[PDB]
PDB file of C-alpha atoms and ligand atoms in Angstrom:
ATOM      1  CA  UNK A1427     120.373 110.551 118.002  1.00 27.42           C
ATOM      2  CA  UNK A1428     120.217 107.692 115.996  1.00 29.14           C
ATOM      3  CA  UNK A1429     119.735 106.875 112.153  1.00 31.79           C
ATOM      4  CA  UNK A1430     116.301 106.041 110.449  1.00 31.24           C
ATOM      5  CA  UNK A1431     114.730 103.684 109.509  1.00 32.67           C
ATOM      6  CA  UNK A1432     114.732 102.566 113.204  1.00 31.74           C
ATOM      7  CA  UNK A1433     112.363  99.933 115.024  1.00 34.05           C
ATOM      8  CA  UNK A1434     111.731 100.499 118.823  1.00 34.07           C
ATOM      9  CA  UNK A1435     111.113  97.882 120.205  1.00 35.19           C
ATOM     10  CA  UNK A1436     107.714  97.722 122.026  1.00 37.68           C
ATOM     11  CA  UNK A1437     107.727  94.308 124.925  1.00 38.88           C
ATOM     12  CA  UNK A1438     104.641  92.674 125.666  1.00 37.56           C
ATOM     13  CA  UNK A1439     102.700  95.236 122.371  1.00 39.65           C
ATOM     14  CA  UNK A1440     100.882  98.442 123.868  1.00 40.30           C
ATOM     15  CA  UNK A1441      98.039  99.230 126.145  1.00 44.29           C
ATOM     16  CA  UNK A1442      95.513 101.653 127.060  1.00 46.48           C
ATOM     17  CA  UNK A1443      97.718 104.774 129.501  1.00 43.49           C
ATOM     18  CA  UNK A1444     101.243 104.249 127.065  1.00 43.22           C
ATOM     19  CA  UNK A1445     102.299 107.025 125.112  1.00 44.32           C
ATOM     20  CA  UNK A1446     104.904 106.770 123.485  1.00 46.18           C
ATOM     21  CA  UNK A1447     107.811 110.072 122.113  1.00 46.87           C
ATOM     22  CA  UNK A1448     109.046 110.385 119.221  1.00 49.21           C
ATOM     23  CA  UNK A1449     110.826 114.015 118.638  1.00 49.54           C
ATOM     24  CA  UNK A1450     113.504 114.196 115.090  1.00 49.86           C
ATOM     25  CA  UNK A1451     113.455 117.089 113.077  1.00 49.12           C
ATOM     26  CA  UNK A1452     112.068 117.713 109.410  1.00 49.29           C
ATOM     27  CA  UNK A1453     115.157 117.130 106.980  1.00 48.69           C
ATOM     28  CA  UNK A1454     114.249 120.415 104.513  1.00 51.91           C
ATOM     29  CA  UNK A1455     112.981 118.180 100.466  1.00 50.80           C
ATOM     30  CA  UNK A1456     111.183 115.744 102.116  1.00 55.71           C
ATOM     31  CA  UNK A1457     108.665 114.337 100.990  1.00 54.98           C
ATOM     32  CA  UNK A1458     106.867 111.246 102.786  1.00 55.61           C
ATOM     33  CA  UNK A1459     107.493 110.615 107.080  1.00 57.45           C
ATOM     34  CA  UNK A1460     105.701 106.900 108.468  1.00 59.97           C
ATOM     35  CA  UNK A1461     104.751 105.278 111.457  1.00 58.72           C
ATOM     36  CA  UNK A1462     104.394 101.366 111.636  1.00 57.60           C
ATOM     37  CA  UNK A1463     102.968 100.319 115.082  1.00 55.41           C
ATOM     38  CA  UNK A1464     103.870  96.822 113.801  1.00 54.69           C
ATOM     39  CA  UNK A1465     102.353  92.788 114.549  1.00 53.36           C
ATOM     40  CA  UNK A1466     104.516  90.542 112.883  1.00 57.39           C
ATOM     41  CA  UNK A1467     104.362  91.888 109.529  1.00 61.32           C
ATOM     42  CA  UNK A1468     101.397  92.793 110.262  1.00 59.95           C
ATOM     43  CA  UNK A1469     100.457  96.744 110.214  1.00 61.01           C
ATOM     44  CA  UNK A1470      98.358  97.888 112.845  1.00 58.39           C
ATOM     45  CA  UNK A1471      98.429 101.577 112.296  1.00 62.32           C
ATOM     46  CA  UNK A1472     101.053 103.444 109.767  1.00 63.48           C
ATOM     47  CA  UNK A1473     100.690 106.919 109.971  1.00 63.95           C
ATOM     48  CA  UNK A1474     102.386 107.969 106.577  1.00 65.30           C
ATOM     49  CA  UNK A1475     102.917 111.877 105.839  1.00 64.15           C
ATOM     50  CA  UNK A1476     102.839 113.159 102.414  1.00 63.60           C
ATOM     51  CA  UNK A1477     104.776 116.418 101.613  1.00 62.68           C
ATOM     52  CA  UNK A1478     104.148 116.250  97.946  1.00 64.56           C
ATOM     53  CA  UNK A1479     100.492 113.700  97.457  1.00 65.74           C
ATOM     54  CA  UNK A1480      99.497 115.588  93.234  1.00 63.58           C
ATOM     55  CA  UNK A1481     100.836 118.861  94.882  1.00 66.44           C
ATOM     56  CA  UNK A1482      99.051 117.853  98.383  1.00 65.70           C
ATOM     57  CA  UNK A1483     100.423 118.481 102.475  1.00 67.13           C
ATOM     58  CA  UNK A1484      98.050 114.794 103.444  1.00 64.79           C
ATOM     59  CA  UNK A1485      98.145 113.201 106.356  1.00 62.98           C
ATOM     60  CA  UNK A1486      97.759 109.280 105.393  1.00 59.75           C
ATOM     61  CA  UNK A1487      96.514 106.459 107.633  1.00 57.97           C
ATOM     62  CA  UNK A1488      96.208 102.718 107.651  1.00 60.90           C
ATOM     63  CA  UNK A1489      96.450  99.648 108.342  1.00 60.49           C
ATOM     64  CA  UNK A1490      98.335  96.397 106.792  1.00 59.85           C
ATOM     65  CA  UNK A1491      96.237  93.076 107.208  1.00 62.82           C
ATOM     66  CA  UNK A1492      98.198  89.897 104.962  1.00 62.67           C
ATOM     67  CA  UNK A1493     100.994  92.042 103.556  1.00 61.23           C
ATOM     68  CA  UNK A1494      97.416  93.939 101.389  1.00 60.66           C
ATOM     69  CA  UNK A1495      96.555  97.656 102.277  1.00 58.54           C
ATOM     70  CA  UNK A1496      93.480  98.215 103.745  1.00 55.72           C
ATOM     71  CA  UNK A1497      90.498 101.631 104.109  1.00 55.80           C
ATOM     72  CA  UNK A1498      92.691 105.541 104.366  1.00 55.86           C
ATOM     73  CA  UNK A1499      92.425 107.225 106.509  1.00 55.27           C
ATOM     74  CA  UNK A1500      93.371 111.176 105.484  1.00 55.89           C
ATOM     75  CA  UNK A1501      93.601 113.901 107.022  1.00 54.06           C
ATOM     76  CA  UNK A1502      94.324 117.507 105.671  1.00 53.39           C
ATOM     77  CA  UNK A1503      95.311 119.717 108.893  1.00 49.45           C
ATOM     78  CA  UNK A1504      99.229 118.762 108.776  1.00 51.03           C
ATOM     79  CA  UNK A1505     101.691 120.353 111.733  1.00 48.22           C
ATOM     80  CA  UNK A1506     104.582 119.305 110.168  1.00 47.53           C
ATOM     81  CA  UNK A1507     106.815 121.460 108.159  1.00 49.02           C
ATOM     82  CA  UNK A1508     110.359 120.823 106.096  1.00 50.53           C
ATOM     83  CA  UNK A1509     113.531 121.958 107.792  1.00 52.46           C
ATOM     84  CA  UNK A1510     111.132 121.572 111.506  1.00 56.61           C
ATOM     85  CA  UNK A1511     112.408 120.543 114.824  1.00 58.73           C
ATOM     86  CA  UNK A1512     108.641 118.262 115.453  1.00 61.56           C
ATOM     87  CA  UNK A1513     106.751 115.435 118.877  1.00 62.42           C
ATOM     88  CA  UNK A1514     105.032 113.091 117.932  1.00 62.85           C
ATOM     89  CA  UNK A1515     103.197 111.790 120.601  1.00 59.59           C
ATOM     90  CA  UNK A1516     100.941 108.847 120.443  1.00 58.12           C
ATOM     91  CA  UNK A1517      98.877 107.472 122.758  1.00 59.56           C
ATOM     92  CA  UNK A1518      96.537 104.818 123.456  1.00 60.60           C
ATOM     93  CA  UNK A1519      93.332 104.886 124.390  1.00 62.26           C
ATOM     94  CA  UNK A1520      90.730 101.745 125.346  1.00 59.92           C
ATOM     95  CA  UNK A1521      89.871 102.377 121.473  1.00 60.64           C
ATOM     96  CA  UNK A1522      91.868 104.303 119.576  1.00 58.32           C
ATOM     97  CA  UNK A1523      95.612 105.783 118.756  1.00 59.29           C
ATOM     98  CA  UNK A1524      95.379 109.463 119.903  1.00 58.10           C
ATOM     99  CA  UNK A1525      97.792 110.988 117.763  1.00 56.91           C
ATOM    100  CA  UNK A1526      99.162 114.983 119.007  1.00 54.80           C
ATOM    101  CA  UNK A1527     102.110 116.926 117.771  1.00 54.63           C
ATOM    102  CA  UNK A1528     103.971 119.869 119.306  1.00 54.23           C
ATOM    103  CA  UNK A1529     101.501 119.512 121.595  1.00 49.67           C
ATOM    104  CA  UNK A1530      98.379 119.697 119.501  1.00 52.57           C
ATOM    105  CA  UNK A1531      95.595 117.202 118.888  1.00 49.48           C
ATOM    106  CA  UNK A1532      95.936 116.173 115.467  1.00 47.10           C
ATOM    107  CA  UNK A1533      93.825 112.860 114.821  1.00 47.17           C
ATOM    108  CA  UNK A1534      92.479 109.131 116.528  1.00 46.06           C
ATOM    109  CA  UNK A1535      92.414 105.924 114.273  1.00 42.05           C
ATOM    110  CA  UNK A1536      90.082 103.957 116.388  1.00 39.49           C
ATOM    111  CA  UNK A1537      92.339  99.892 116.905  1.00 37.85           C
ATOM    112  CA  UNK A1538      91.059  98.216 113.591  1.00 38.62           C
ATOM    113  CA  UNK A1539      94.480  95.589 115.621  1.00 39.82           C
ATOM    114  CA  UNK A1540      92.329  94.399 118.886  1.00 41.77           C
ATOM    115  CA  UNK A1541      95.414  92.340 119.973  1.00 41.96           C
ATOM    116  CA  UNK A1542      97.470  95.697 121.474  1.00 43.16           C
ATOM    117  CA  UNK A1543      99.116  93.321 123.617  1.00 43.28           C
ATOM    118  CA  UNK A1544     100.584  91.347 120.838  1.00 43.37           C
ATOM    119  CA  UNK A1545     101.669  95.751 118.951  1.00 42.74           C
ATOM    120  CA  UNK A1546     105.113  94.850 119.112  1.00 43.93           C
ATOM    121  CA  UNK A1547     107.534  96.956 117.553  1.00 42.00           C
ATOM    122  CA  UNK A1548     106.819 100.908 115.248  1.00 40.54           C
ATOM    123  CA  UNK A1549     109.047 100.691 112.098  1.00 39.37           C
ATOM    124  CA  UNK A1550     110.187 104.935 111.816  1.00 40.43           C
ATOM    125  CA  UNK A1551     110.818 105.612 108.347  1.00 41.11           C
ATOM    126  CA  UNK A1552     111.563 108.544 106.292  1.00 40.97           C
ATOM    127  CA  UNK A1553     112.388 111.843 105.354  1.00 42.07           C
ATOM    128  CA  UNK A1554     113.405 112.896 109.197  1.00 43.32           C
ATOM    129  CA  UNK A1555     116.341 113.915 111.826  1.00 42.08           C
ATOM    130  CA  UNK A1556     115.785 110.986 114.593  1.00 43.32           C
ATOM    131  CA  UNK A1557     116.764 112.756 118.003  1.00 41.88           C
ATOM    132  CA  UNK A1558     114.265 109.946 120.334  1.00 40.35           C
ATOM    133  CA  UNK A1559     111.862 107.710 120.276  1.00 39.86           C
ATOM    134  CA  UNK A1560     110.890 106.346 123.887  1.00 42.59           C
ATOM    135  CA  UNK A1561     108.020 106.079 126.123  1.00 39.40           C
ATOM    136  CA  UNK A1562     106.043 106.468 129.188  1.00 36.52           C
ATOM    137  CA  UNK A1563     102.774 105.306 131.148  1.00 38.75           C
ATOM    138  CA  UNK A1564     100.876 108.181 131.659  1.00 37.04           C
TER     139      UNK A1564
HETATM  140  C1  LIG B 214     103.565 103.645  97.753  1.00 33.80           C
HETATM  141  O1  LIG B 214     102.908 103.233  98.838  1.00 33.80           O
HETATM  142  C2  LIG B 214     102.492 103.830 100.086  1.00 33.80           C
HETATM  143  C3  LIG B 214     102.744 103.067 101.465  1.00 33.80           C
HETATM  144  N1  LIG B 214     103.582 103.011 101.966  1.00 33.80           N
HETATM  145  C4  LIG B 214     104.755 104.203 102.599  1.00 33.80           C
HETATM  146  C5  LIG B 214     105.192 103.546 102.664  1.00 33.80           C
HETATM  147  C6  LIG B 214     106.883 104.518 103.683  1.00 33.80           C
HETATM  148  C7  LIG B 214     107.740 102.922 102.878  1.00 33.80           C
HETATM  149  C8  LIG B 214     108.806 103.885 103.667  1.00 33.80           C
HETATM  150  C9  LIG B 214     108.532 104.786 104.036  1.00 33.80           C
HETATM  151 CL1  LIG B 214     110.739 106.132 104.084  1.00 33.80          CL
HETATM  152  C10 LIG B 214     107.727 105.727 104.260  1.00 33.80           C
HETATM  153  F1  LIG B 214     107.625 107.013 104.503  1.00 33.80           F
HETATM  154  C11 LIG B 214     107.056 105.724 103.787  1.00 33.80           C
HETATM  155  F2  LIG B 214     105.520 106.070 103.577  1.00 33.80           F
HETATM  156  N2  LIG B 214     105.687 102.241 102.835  1.00 33.80           N
HETATM  157  N3  LIG B 214     104.236 102.225 102.036  1.00 33.80           N
HETATM  158  C12 LIG B 214     101.122 103.494 102.210  1.00 33.80           C
HETATM  159  O2  LIG B 214     101.304 104.180 102.645  1.00 33.80           O
HETATM  160  C13 LIG B 214     100.449 103.489 102.313  1.00 33.80           C
HETATM  161  C14 LIG B 214      98.953 103.188 102.956  1.00 33.80           C
HETATM  162  O3  LIG B 214      96.984 103.317 102.790  1.00 33.80           O
HETATM  163  O4  LIG B 214      99.415 103.417 100.643  1.00 33.80           O
HETATM  164  C15 LIG B 214     100.581 103.000  99.811  1.00 33.80           C
HETATM  165  C16 LIG B 214     100.272 101.400  99.258  1.00 33.80           C
HETATM  166  C17 LIG B 214      98.805 101.509  99.156  1.00 33.80           C
HETATM  167  C18 LIG B 214      97.659 102.331  99.518  1.00 33.80           C
HETATM  168  N4  LIG B 214      96.404 101.369  99.239  1.00 33.80           N
HETATM  169  C19 LIG B 214      94.685 101.080  98.286  1.00 33.80           C
HETATM  170  C20 LIG B 214      94.557 103.124  98.686  1.00 33.80           C
HETATM  171  O5  LIG B 214      93.673 102.966  98.637  1.00 33.80           O
HETATM  172  C21 LIG B 214      93.637 101.608 100.016  1.00 33.80           C
HETATM  173  C22 LIG B 214      94.513 101.466 100.256  1.00 33.80           C
HETATM  174  F3  LIG B 214      95.266 102.244 100.880  1.00 33.80           F
HETATM  175  N5  LIG B 214      97.722 100.455  98.281  1.00 33.80           N
HETATM  176  N6  LIG B 214      98.832 100.189  98.269  1.00 33.80           N
END
């Protein structure tokens, strides 16, 4: 177990068939969780579960370029629960990130940042106890 925020290095960036696994537990009072796949200061892919946005639970995905947030992609399917252990898996595919939570497909996010081999850090932050963060090639 690790204390958030945590940066996982992705040396040489990401590549299709790379599977990133984040294990941890949602804190009881949780408000938010964030994963940030970074290319330098740009955020190629921000994955942001919000537990109470206007009293609704939503997943917000976006990209940050030149320090400006782009167009949000939102999903109301919400597989996280306060207090519960989770597994987020991010599968890098040629044209998108694919996310599954607790072994159920959640969403796909098309690559806006094209230079996958420069997406060299994953930030993990928010209302979680982080158990582990690793990757493998499938
Ligand atoms: C309030 O800040 C968030 C951003 N955010 C979250 C965290 C954050 C930090 C720490 C933790 Cl621990 C954690 F979980 C976290 F989510 N930091 N920045 C990010 O979620 C962003 C995504 O679009 O929305 C907001 C910022 C935003 C969005 N938009 C417009 C709205 O429509 C189009 C464009 F997007 N302008 N600004």
